[PDB]
């Protein structure tokens, strides 16, 4: 980078992602998406329980 450089320019994990053209185009972490959807539903249920 122009300011700070922590990572290598040939680091394997970064290269494995960038090279996977599908991952660049669309990327998801489905597990975390499930967990966050359940977190939202649980917060709504907590609100309704408090009102009850």
């Amino acid at each position: 980078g122009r300011l700070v450089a922590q990572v290598p320019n040939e680091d394997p994990e970064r290269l494995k992602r960038v090279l996977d053209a599908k991952w660049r185009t669309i990327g998801v972490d489905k597990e975390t998406l499930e967990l966050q959807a359940q977190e939202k539903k649980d917060r709504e249920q907590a609100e309704k329980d408090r009102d009850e």
Binding site: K16, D20, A21, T25
Partner: protein, 58 residues
């Protein structure tokens, strides 16, 4: 042998890195990526989402 004519059944040229049917995997050259209907040919597609970063390509 009768050859199918006209368009339909997207093939080795229209296949590209980013579309809605092309499978996951590492590919450096577009013409190499362009033949997965040739390379893979009958795996279950759970395996393609499993092996996200792996060659298994021409």
């Amino acid at each position: 042998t009768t050859v199918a004519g006209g368009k339909g059944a997207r093939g080795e040229i229209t296949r590209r890195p980013g579309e809605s049917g092309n499978p996951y995997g590492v590919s450096v050259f577009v013409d190499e990526y362009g033949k997965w209907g040739s390379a893979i040919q009958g795996m279950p597609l759970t395996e393609t989402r499993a092996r996200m970063q792996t060659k298994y390509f021409p």
